[PDB]
Structure formats: structure tokens, C-alpha cells
Amino acid sequence: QISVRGLAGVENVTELKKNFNRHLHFTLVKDRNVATPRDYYFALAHTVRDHLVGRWIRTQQHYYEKDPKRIYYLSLEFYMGRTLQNTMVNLALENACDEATYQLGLDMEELEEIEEDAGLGNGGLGRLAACFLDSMATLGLAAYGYGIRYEFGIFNQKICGGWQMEEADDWLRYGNPWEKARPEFTLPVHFYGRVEHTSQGAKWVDTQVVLAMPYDTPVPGYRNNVVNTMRLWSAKAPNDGYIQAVLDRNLAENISRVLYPNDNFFEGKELRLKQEYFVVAATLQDIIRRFKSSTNFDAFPDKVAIQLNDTHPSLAIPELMRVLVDLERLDWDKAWEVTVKTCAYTNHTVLPEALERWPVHLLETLLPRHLQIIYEINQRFLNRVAAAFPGDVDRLRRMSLVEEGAVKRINMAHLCIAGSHAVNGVARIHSEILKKTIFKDFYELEPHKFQNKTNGITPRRWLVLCNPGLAEIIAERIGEEYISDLDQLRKLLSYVDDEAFIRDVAKVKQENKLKFAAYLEREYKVHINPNSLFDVQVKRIHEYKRQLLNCLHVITLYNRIKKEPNKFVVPRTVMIGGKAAPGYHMAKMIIKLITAIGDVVNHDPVVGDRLRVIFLENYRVSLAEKVIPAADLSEQISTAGTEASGTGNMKFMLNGALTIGTMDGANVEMAEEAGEENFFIFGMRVEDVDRLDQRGYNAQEYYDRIPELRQIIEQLSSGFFSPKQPDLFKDIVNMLMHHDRFKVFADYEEYVKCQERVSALYKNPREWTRMVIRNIATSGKFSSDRTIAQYAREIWGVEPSRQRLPA
Amino acid sequence: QISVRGLAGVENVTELKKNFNRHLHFTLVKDRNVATPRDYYFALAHTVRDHLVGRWIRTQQHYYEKDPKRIYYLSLEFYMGRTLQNTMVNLALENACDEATYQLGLDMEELEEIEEDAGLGNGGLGRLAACFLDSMATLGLAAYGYGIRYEFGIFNQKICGGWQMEEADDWLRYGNPWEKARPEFTLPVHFYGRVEHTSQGAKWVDTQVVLAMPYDTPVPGYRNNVVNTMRLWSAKAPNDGYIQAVLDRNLAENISRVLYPNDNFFEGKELRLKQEYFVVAATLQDIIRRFKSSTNFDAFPDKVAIQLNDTHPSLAIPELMRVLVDLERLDWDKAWEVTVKTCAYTNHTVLPEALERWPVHLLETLLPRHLQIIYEINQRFLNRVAAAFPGDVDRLRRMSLVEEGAVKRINMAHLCIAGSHAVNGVARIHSEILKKTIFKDFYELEPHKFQNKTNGITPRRWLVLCNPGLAEIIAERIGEEYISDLDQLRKLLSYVDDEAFIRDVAKVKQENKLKFAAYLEREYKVHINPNSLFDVQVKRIHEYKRQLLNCLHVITLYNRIKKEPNKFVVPRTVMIGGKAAPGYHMAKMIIKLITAIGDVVNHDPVVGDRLRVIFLENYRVSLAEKVIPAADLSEQISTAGTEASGTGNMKFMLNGALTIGTMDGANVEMAEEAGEENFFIFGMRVEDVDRLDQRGYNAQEYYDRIPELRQIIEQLSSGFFSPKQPDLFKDIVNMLMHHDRFKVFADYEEYVKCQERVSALYKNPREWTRMVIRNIATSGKFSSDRTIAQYAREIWGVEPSRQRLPA
Numbered sequence A, B: 001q002i003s004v005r006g007l008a009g010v011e012n013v014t015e016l017k018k019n020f021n022r023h024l025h026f027t028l029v030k031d032r033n034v035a036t037p038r039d040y041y042f043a044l045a046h047t048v049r050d051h052l053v054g055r056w057i058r059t060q061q062h063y064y065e066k067d068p069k070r071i072y073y074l075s076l077e078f079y080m081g082r083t084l085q086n087t088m089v090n091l092a093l094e095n096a097c098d099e100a101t102y103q104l105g106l107d108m109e110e111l112e113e114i115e116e117d118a119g120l121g122n123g124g125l126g127r128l129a130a131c132f133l134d135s136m137a138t139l140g141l142a143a144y145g146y147g148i149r150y151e152f153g154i155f156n157q158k159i160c161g162g163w164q165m166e167e168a169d170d171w172l173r174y175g176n177p178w179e180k181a182r183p184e185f186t187l188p189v190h191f192y193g194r195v196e197h198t199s200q201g202a203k204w205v206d207t208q209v210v211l212a213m214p215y216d217t218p219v220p221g222y223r224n225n226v227v228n229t230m231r232l233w234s235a236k237a238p239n240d241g242y243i244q245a246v247l248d249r250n251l252a253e254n255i256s257r258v259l260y261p262n263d264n265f266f267e268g269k270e271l272r273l274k275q276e277y278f279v280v281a282a283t284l285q286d287i288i289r290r291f292k293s294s295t296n297f298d299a300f301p302d303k304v305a306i307q308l309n310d311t312h313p314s315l316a317i318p319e320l321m322r323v324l325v326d327l328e329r330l331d332w333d334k335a336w337e338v339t340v341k342t343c344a345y346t347n348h349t350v351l352p353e354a355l356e357r358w359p360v361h362l363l364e365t366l367l368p369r370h371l372q373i374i375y376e377i378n379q380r381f382l383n384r385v386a387a388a389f390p391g392d393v394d395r396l397r398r399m400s401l402v403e404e405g406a407v408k409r410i411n412m413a414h415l416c417i418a419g420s421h422a423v424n425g426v427a428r429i430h431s432e433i434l435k436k437t438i439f440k441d442f443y444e445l446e447p448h449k450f451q452n453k454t455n456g457i458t459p460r461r462w463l464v465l466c467n468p469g470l471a472e473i474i475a476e477r478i479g480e481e482y483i484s485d486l487d488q489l490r491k492l493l494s495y496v497d498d499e500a501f502i503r504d505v506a507k508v509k510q511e512n513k514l515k516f517a518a519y520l521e522r523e524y525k526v527h528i529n530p531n532s533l534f535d536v537q538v539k540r541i542h543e544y545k546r547q548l549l550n551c552l553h554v555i556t557l558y559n560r561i562k563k564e565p566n567k568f569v570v571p572r573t574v575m576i577g578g579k580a581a582p583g584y585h586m587a588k589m590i591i592k593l594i595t596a597i598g599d600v601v602n603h604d605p606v607v608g609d610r611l612r613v614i615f616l617e618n619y620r621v622s623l624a625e626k627v628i629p630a631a632d633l634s635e636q637i638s639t640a641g642t643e644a645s646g647t648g649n650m651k652f653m654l655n656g657a658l659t660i661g662t663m664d665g666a667n668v669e670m671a672e673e674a675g676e677e678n679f680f681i682f683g684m685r686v687e688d689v690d691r692l693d694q695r696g697y698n699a700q701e702y703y704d705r706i707p708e709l710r711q712i713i714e715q716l717s718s719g720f721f722s723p724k725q726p727d728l729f730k731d732i733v734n735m736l737m738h739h740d741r742f743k744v745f746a747d748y749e750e751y752v753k754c755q756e757r758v759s760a761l762y763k764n765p766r767e768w769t770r771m772v773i774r775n776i777a778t779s780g781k782f783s784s785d786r787t788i789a790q791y792a793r794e795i796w797g798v799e800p801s802r803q804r805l806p807a
């Protein structure tokens, strides 16, 4: 039906139909008279999967013959979403399958909705890893993603009486057709035990053994016939009264059971540390085996790069040393040189409560040999510091990997900097913050280590797949090359005064809004005006992301309507969605507040359909793919200095929403690419936040001088939004008035004023749409293809390639 | 190569080859350069499985159209063994696959050895269920086997220093290609809670819910294109801090984790009771759904038969009542009539420690509604007893389902008799014992309930599959019809004087012995003389089976050799194998004793190769298929009255071994079919055992009057067989001398004398072989096809059929 979705060849359509029927009969063991839609989904999935494996086998064959340098991307999270549609898009099969399924009497979009998300991540860090795998395949790199095959991913969120309820995400219940178990590559991982010293060096003995069993998932590049591998490890007990011993096998297997859903506060939990070591130990053995099967580890850094996605896999550093020193008998200095040249570390946050600092006593018990290696690393590192800055004893204690105090801890970030040849932040302002504040000492010691790599998103999933209409009208004007070369979108600047294009952009958006408005009614039974401005804030719930500031704006609009009901205001649907970490009480209160505001606002006859507040339940990748194409306004309103980058921001920009935000994370580079006049910038800069901290932030001052703000706080305290429990929101008021680390009141006035400028522009459709074109046209820098090309050239030492492999 | 293995059509061989390559590439995601033998096995398994599913789908379709009466065979155990070869045999594909694999450069027999046993049973009861499924499919009955998909089957046995060690049988580790998960048919099962009474009857409330997820395995009949289903239930937690709640899901799922390996002593363990209820509750819901999808339960007994394999699924009785009364609102009397006409019960033992007697307090807590129904059943039953035998108060207490004492218990056998229209034993003498002793009261009340159904074995697995040589030379003379009509083997009586046949029988046996002798050396590195008589005792280790009596004979032979070294004796390899229940201390000592005797005997230069004693490790179905065709002598030496039937006995008879045994279980009918002169019968009959019990068994008497016996006991006590721990076997000596329930010494003299007659015959090959022919020729009655035809006609009310379904 549309051109970007590929050819529907008669031969191809015929072949797909017969393979579909083959799988329905032989794979699913069903016939057309009892098959459910779920069965039809699976028969299609298996049909599409068959087209991967030929390319999968020859890609891996190709890497064996050519032996290029291999990139190993280590992460505890891969937030993959659904695979079926992505795979069709990258193989150019979407229209053929559509035709083929239509001819069998089935609607393919209906079948697409049956697939579970692979929710093996929390948010931005996990989704970044998923975008990166896609870009790495698309750019022909010999790359492997390594992680854990969690049995339960991020919880499903239900809202019950306005409160978040968690329920287990049993995503493997019906099977996963994309994975292939590889039990023949099972590897042992050790825990506990103790260290013996001998003439022949140290030995780690009396250990408990857990098996790591790999499951491989294919990762197709965009129309280049490259298919890379994501290898995820599952935990299994070794095979050595009787009944209880068999039931106690569950204790080993609990390692890979569940994704840890805490994305705000570091907790020293043993089970988490076991997960970290497990993925690291199995991956490194696998890496080494692959390297040997092509004595001399001098060439290891020329054949292997290991990228550490935050500190979560930081134990790769002492594990590589353990293997090289204890098992392969390299001398310390040589092993260290190999380790540093092999490893690189990416930081994804500056909030101090988020840094991993493991208690020594845990490491002592679980990984006694690793603690020894860490102490040794620390001592040799601090000797280099002492020699470069003689007499600076304060620097020595600040830079130590060991932190003293009540409990001693290892700082995993310091470990990563010491053992890596490159350290990067994830947007320019974040990388500067790293150098100027929390890693300043390390930057002064080794300035050459520190780099920037601004994040990106894949334009396959985040434009072609989720917004086919937009991709199509773009392709009409400029062709299809932009999909793997997103800088070509600049060519759209020459259509900013073209009346037909202006009309098509606006129509795509409007169709997206109608489609989403319908979805809301169908799956969640309430109605919205699709002529309103769709004001959208979607991301995990955190105080730093300031969903509360949005809440304050919403109540301001409501109060202004009640004050002058018969005055005209631009109507709005305000949508906020996202999950809260289960232990994070304040985040859970914020969700309740949002639903509570909705309860009042949505049932006020005087408001009518001019203002609606919806909490979008169970935000996840599949829901992002629906709501982001329907958005007019993107809320990116974190306190300056707190959002390392953001990636949702880039998704909205690519899909035709305008952005209101602070000068934080990648927003800065986004406004720079589009021009500041085409972005709704407000609020304190990083410099202003600092000045406010020097002085002391006093929230009472703002309450005293802004009557509209005072009125909101009084409504909150008095029970206006919680009539049956007047004090429900006292924790929120109290935090805002006395304990607000993120200075919500300080940006309130400028935010509200900036929101008025948004409303003004929306009244003039033609000029709104013209500003949108200018955003879409300049969004090219934010392709993860750009990001990965920079990692490849400046960190990994490999050259990307856009050349096809033979089909 | 041989005729019974089917045609190797050029078309067929070509097709198998291409499908083999298809699965290797698309299913296993491998190429010929990295494939292991395990991969080749799987590609063949998937190739063969594809030929099942067409027939599977149309068989189940056929039953839907025709709606015959359905047979539901409920068992906690299905001891299936390997599936690949069985499936080829029943589909007539064995020679085609052999050819096809040979042409690909592979040896099919090598690939067959890679398959894991499905060891979902302990022994005779579990293997009987497996033979029965095969016969039911072969006879065209609409039959389903229902059980539990245990994650761990019967343990693997290792012998370490002569002691049994158990290790977990992780049989699903590499996947199971024969099963199909059916998550869409998942059903809820309830536990705990409490009973509320209302105007509208009883309600069972506040229950914990476990999900039952079915996995279907195909069961092919012999060359009739019928494919029945074995449905095995797996336990899953429902989807409703956070981390711990997710990890606690394992508690629900433990229900289906492990096969209970105790086959000697009843233990009231809650987890076992949960397994019993779980299989029962999910199966009954499934049965009812199937019945409704064709109000009126009057026709339920005309459409449904439920066979209870021992008392293990006895809760089907009160569960069917619960469903009919509480949920469908039938009145008690009508529901009871339906239940009795639907259910039938098979007893598989008379040892009192083996009967299930659950403590009331367990039922009270776990299944409070079921206890109520059981009390009500009991009261109405005992009113019928009182009315038939007025004033017989002693009868009332003997027949009660409730047993009083320290702890009150429910007798599950009494429950089964009360709620079933038929009760059967499993060999004629066993069924008579039921009527005369432990169920005498019940027989006097309802004599029409009591039947016999003598056990059998499937001649597909137990002749064609495991002894192709023998099957072939038989087919040369009499054709192939015998394979599904085993009575035709009688025609072989006319070849008992045929010199060529005599020679072929003896050659098959000899080739089987050489093949097995080789296997021993290869997988278990020690050597045996293949010209010796292979004296074999294989079965679970129990005191009643009297492996100890065999041990006493072996030591007698050894002592006679040492006394007269230069005298001639018929050389023997004595093989004993089997597993012991983990908690059964005496059985574990017997295994140690056997290995200990081996240690002395096998390293005595004076003995040479005239006597060897091997303990066959890890006896299981796949090992049975190897050792039984190689046997000359079958040891079936249980104390008269204790082995309900035996089935191993029948396997040996079919495969050309002579039997030495007591007049116990099916041995009685075997000797009757072959003629007593063609069987080595010795020992007390049931009547003699009784007389001895009246008098009092005093083992000292035998020790005092038999010098050879005294010498053995002295060797045992003094440490002859355990030099470094002289008292190791004091428990054994003490049991034999003072506490022997099974009267080992009482049969010693007659056993030893009977063993001399065996040796005498073996010296005359021609006459040995002539006796063998007479056994094989009369083994037809012991086909499970005969057994199942009798269940069908006399219990289930359905007619078997040998007619093909269309291919």
C-alpha cells in the first residue's frame, strides 16, 4: 500500500502463504477450524524468522572467515520491545506479509498486537542498548550484546483507585519464537569459596557453581543482510533429603529470575551483585574462547572491545585481571595493559544516590579473589596519583576506589575510570559536568580518557515502524536513503514554504491523533477531543524529571478556567505516563496526585472538553510507539543538570512534536540544531541552579510572591483534590515547601509563561506546522547511527560500513 | 536390511533427507560444519515428528465427529522411555530413516543413544501405564493418558564405592521435541480455604490458586494411523517486597517439580497430596469441558470412563462429587450413581505399608470440602453395610473409610472400592488374594465389583524394537501379523523339532549376548565371558523381591568352587540391577552387599572366568531394552503372595530366556501357558507361607540344619566380604536371623537345587533352545493388547478395533 514498506512480489506472497500454512500445521499442530489469533501470530512469527536464519548463519560464518575486531556491549538491560514488525521492516517484507496475510483472510496489524514486549529494561539506559544493537548491525560491525535472560521483565502497571499496582510480567508464558537456546555452550560461574596462596600464585577454591546457559536472539541490520547476535544468559543448577535437595535448585536459578526495577536509589542487595557477576563471568569466558579459537594476549585489545553500560558490569575489570593473572599466568603489568586497552565505560547519571558503592563485606564473602585484585588495583593507582600530585593527601582519599566510613565500600565508578582507556558521558553538557564536578580529579590526572558521545535513537523503530505515514510523505519528496542516513532530512528545509507539504505534515499528525484517540476509548474506555493540543510527558516517574511541575501547570489552567469560565483557551489533552520504582514512595504519591487531578478536572461541567488530564497506564516501548506519533507537545522539563541526556526527547522531535524544556541533557544540542527560535526553552540554566544553591534555596519566597502558586498549595493542603482524605498530599506539600532538591517553584513562573507562548502558536496551524518541519528537518544528528559511528571510530578503533552482504 | 523394519522407498528416502536438512538449518539454526551428534539426533526427531502430526490432527478430528465413549487413564506415573525408535516402528519408517541417514553419512543407532529416557515413573506401575497407552492406540480406542509433567524424573543412579548415589535427572535440559505446550488450555486448581454453607448449598472459598498448564505428547498405534494423546500437567503461579513476591512463585511451581521416588513405604507428605489433587482437579475439569462441548449428566457414564491407576488419583471420586453437587447442583444420589458408573480402580499391591492412609488433619487443612464429602460417602456406605449384615459391628469398623487411632486417617483403597463399579487385581492369584484377605468384607458385600485383569507388555517395544533379530526369524516362518496378534506365536510350536529354527534362535541369542558384552566394556570398562549363562535379576530393590536370596545362591557357588577348584561347573555371569528408594536403608545395604560380593568373586584367580557378579548401574527402560534380549535366565523369586503380577517376567519370556521363579503373581499363569515342565518352579506356595506363619517362622532352624547356609552367615558376620569394616553387614544378618518378613532361608534349599537343574539343562544347548521355543511360542497371552481388550469389554463397555484410519 505504501512505498517504504517494500515490494509485494507475486512469487514472494505465494511463498509466505505456504510457509504460513506449513507452520500452522507442523509447528503449532493446529488447523484453521480451531486456531486462535494467537496461533496466527505465531505462524507468521515463525514464517518471518525463517528468513533470518540463512542470513544469521552466513553473517556469523563471515565473521569467522574475516576475523574482524569484535565489539562486546555488556548491559544488565536490553529494552527490546516487540520484534515481528521490526524484523519485517529490516528485511523489506512488510508489504509482502501484509498482502500474504490479507489473502489468508487475516489482518496483520491485529496479529502484531498479540506479541509481548521483551521488557528486559527499566527505561532510557535499557532502550539505548536496544537502539545501539540495531545501529551496530545496520553499520556492519561485528557486535554482540550480552546480558541476562530475565524470566520476569519490568512489571506490568495497573492503576487501582489511582494507585500503581505491580504485577509480574510473565513474558515467556506462550514461548518466545525469536530466541534459540544453546545448552551446548553452557558455562560455569563461581561464587563464595576462599583464596589459597601457593608457589604457583593464588587459587580460588571451595566455590559454589552456577551454570550459565545462553539463549541467542538475532539482530537484523537495515536491508544489508547482516544479522548479529544478542546472547542472554540463563541460570541453571549443576546436577549434583533427596526431595528437598531437588527443590533447592531454585536458589541458584533465582539469579536470572527477575529484572531489578529500581532506577533511582542504590541498594546493596546480594542477589543484584550476583546478577552483575553472573553476566560478567559467563560473558568473559565466552569472549576468550572465541578469541582463542581463531598464548599471545598482546593482540587481545586489537581483536576485542568491551563496552560497559554504566558500572553495572564493572566487575569485568577485575574478572579479566583474575583470568589473565591467575589462570593464564600473565604478569600483573601486562595483564593490566591488556585490560585498560580492552575496556571502556559509559556514565549515565550524576545523581550521587545512583552510584554503585558496594560494601566490602559483601565482596569479601561472595568474591574474595576480586576484592584482593581491587585492593591491588587501588594501591597501584594511588601510587600514580601520589607521584603526579605530591603531597596532595586530600586528592588521594577523594580518588581512592575504597571509601572509608561506618561501612567501607568500593566505588565502582572509580574502578571503571581506572581500568578503562575511555570514559564518556551521553550528551555534551553531561560530559562537561563529569569533567568539572564529580570526576574532576580523574580528568586532571588523565584528560585524554574523557570523551562525549551524544545519545541517539534508531530511525527504523522510531520513524518508519511507528509512523509510516510520516515516513512516506518524506520519502515522496526526498527518497528513501534518509532511513540509514538521517542527515538527509535537512533537505526538507527547502519545503518549509511548500503549501502541499505543510498540508501533508498536518494531515499525518491529525490521522495519528485520531488513531490514538480511538485506541484510548477501545482499550481504556474514556473519550478525548482530538482537536485539542496533545500535551505529553512520558518517562519513568522521578522527582528530577519534575512531573510535579507539569502538575502545577495543569492546576493553574484549571483555576484560570474556573475564574473566567467564558473566556477562550486553547483546548488541551494533558497526558502523563510512566512507572514508579516499587520502593519509591514519593513517585508513587505523584502518580496518585495525577489521577486525583484528573478526577476533579475531567468531571467539571464548566471545563467541558477544554482540558482533560489522562494518566497513561503501563507505559512501555509498545505504548511509546503509539503515543509519540500522536503528540503535539513534548515535555522535557528536568531541573538543569540532572537529565544526563534523555532519548524520549529525540523520539518526539523526529515525529513532529514541538518541545518545551529546560537547557538540560540533549535538549541543549536539539535547540542548537533546530535554532532556539524553534524550541520552547525556559527556566534556570545549570549556572543559575548553582547560584541558587550557594545562596540557599528557600521555597517559601516563591509561595509568598506568587498568588497563583499559593492558591495551588492551599488547595493541595486543604483537601480540594482528596475530599475524603484531606491530608493525603501533605508529604508532597511538605517536600515542595521544605525539602525540594529539584527546585520546582523556582521554574514555575517562566514555565507557565512559556506554556502561554505554546498556546499562542497552536492557534496558528500553518506557523505551528512550519516550526515542526524545522524540527524534523534538523533531527538527523540524533540518529543512533551517528552515535555508533562515533563510538566505532573514537573508542573501539573499527570502521563502520554500509555495504550489503550477499543474499 | 530386515523385513519387519518396513520399506525404504526411493521417494520416501529422498523426502526424509530434505526434511532432515530443512530442520538442521531452520529449526536448529546450524550447518553441517558445526553440528554435533546431538544436533543430528534432533533434526531426525523433528523429521519423524512431522509424520505424526497429520495423523494426530485427524485422529482427534475423527473423535470429535464420531463422539465415541472416551477412556481416561489417570496415573501419577508414565514410564515412557525413549520415543524416536518407537515412533519409527509404529509408522513403518525405520528402514527408510536408516537408509536416509546412512546416505547423509550418519549412523542412526548412534543418534538413537543420544535421546534421554522419559523416566516419569519408578517401575512396574509406571511402565504398565506406558504399555497400556500403546495398546490402546493400537486397538483404536479413544483414550487419553493424564498425569504430571515432572521436571525431574526418577533419579540417575551412580555407584560410588559400592553405594548408590542419587543425582537429579534433568531430562528436559536440551528440550523435548515430542511434547507440545498448550498454554491456552490452562486451568485453575484450588487448595486450602474453607467451606461456607448457604441457602444455595456449600461453597469452597478463600482458596489459593495454582494454574495447571497442559503439555500434549502423541501416542501412535501400530500401523493403523491412530495417534492418541498423553496430556501431562505443569504447575504455574497466577500473575497476581516486589522482588520476594516474584521469587515466591517457585512455591506453587514445586508441585510438578519432582517425581516422588518412594515405592515401598507410604508417607503422609503434604507435597505428595498436592500432586495427587493437582492431577485430579485439572483432569476432571478437562474431561467435563470435553463432554459439554459435543445439563444432562445422565449420559456422562455412557461417554466417559475413568480408570484409577492405584489409589494415587483416588481423589477423583470426591472431586467428581464436589463438581456435580456444588457446581452443577445435581442431588447427591444422582451424582453418586454417575460417579460409581464412571470410575474403576486397579490395585497393584497387598503389602499393608504400601496402602495410602492420609491423616485427616492434612485433608482438613488442604481440602476441607473433600473431607466433608468423604465423611458423607462413608456414612451412606456404612448404612448399606449395617442393613446387609445387621448387628455386625466389627464389620462396620473394618469397612469404614475412616480409621480411628492415635491419628485418624482415610483409607483410600476403601474409598476407591466404594466409589467404583469395578475393582481389579493384576494377575489371577493376586485377584483371588484380594477377595480372600484384604478386601474380603467388600467382596461379600458386592461380589460383582471384583474382577481380574492379568497384566501384559507391548510386543512393539518389548520384541520388535529391542530384539529385531528375533522378530525377523519369527516373521520368516509365520509372517508379520503376530505383532498385533501375539497369540499367533503358538504356530511356532510346529518348529520345535526344526533344526534350522533351533539354530537361528540360538544364534540370535548369542549375537544379543555379544552385543551386550561389548556394551558393558565400552560404557562401563570391565570384561565378561559371553559363553557363560547370563543369569539376570533386574527390578527395583525390595526385600520382598529377594535379591538377597539370589545373593545367597551366588556365595554358595563361590564356596563350592573354592572347596573343589578343579571340578567342572557351568560358567555364569550373574547380573543384578535396580534402584533403591532413597530412604530405604535395607535396600541400600543390599546394593552394597552385591557390589561387595563382586569385589571378592571377580578378583579370585581360582574362580577365573567361571563366575562373575556384576551390578548393573542405573537400570531404566533403555537399559532393559538392551539386557533383556541378552538374558538366558530370568530371576523371578519373590516370596509367594507378594508380587501382585510382575511384568519384567513377561519381557524375558518373550525374548528367549528361561524363568526360575516361585508360584507368585503372573509366574503362575506363565507356567500354565508354557507347561510346568518348561519352567523352573521352586519354593513355598502361598498355602505353605500361611502354614509357616501360623506356626511361627524361626530362621535359626534353617541355620542349624544347613551347613552351607551357616557358612555363608558366618562369612557375612565375620567380615569376609568387608575386610576393612568387619561388621558392615550386621544389619543384614540380624534381619535374616530374627526379623525376616519374607522368609529367605525357608526357600534356600529348594532354590539351590532348582539352580542345579538349570545348569544341567544349559550343558545341552539343543534341549535348552527347545525349551526356549516352547516359552516364546506360548507367551502370547501376555500381550497388553489382550489385557486392554479385556478392560475395554468387561469394564469400560467399548469395543476394540484393528481397522486403519486413512492416511
Ligand SMILES: CC(C)c1ccc(C[C@@H](C)C(=O)N[C@@H]2O[C@H](CO)[C@@H](O)[C@H](O)[C@H]2O)cc1
Binding pocket: A123, A124, A125, A126, A128, A262, A263, A264, A265, A266, A267, A310, A348, A349, A354, A355, A356, A426, A455, A643, A644, A645, A646, A647, A665
Ligand atoms: C539502582 C541504581 C544502580 C540505578 C540508578 C539509576 C538508574 C538509571 C540510569 C542508569 C539511567 O537509566 N540513566 C539514563 O540513561 C539514558 C541513556 O544514556 C539517558 O538518556 C538518561 O538521561 C539517563 O537518566 C539505574 C540503576
Ligand SMILES: CC(C)c1ccc(C[C@@H](C)C(=O)N[C@@H]2O[C@H](CO)[C@@H](O)[C@H](O)[C@H]2O)cc1
Binding pocket: B123, B124, B125, B126, B128, B262, B263, B264, B265, B266, B267, B310, B348, B349, B354, B355, B356, B426, B455, B643, B644, B645, B646, B647, B665
Ligand atoms: C509410596 C507408596 C504410595 C507406594 C508403594 C508402592 C508402590 C509401588 C506399586 C504401586 C507398584 O509398582 N506395583 C507393581 O505394579 C505392577 C503393575 O501392576 C505389578 O506388575 C507389580 O507386581 C507391582 O508390585 C508405589 C507407591
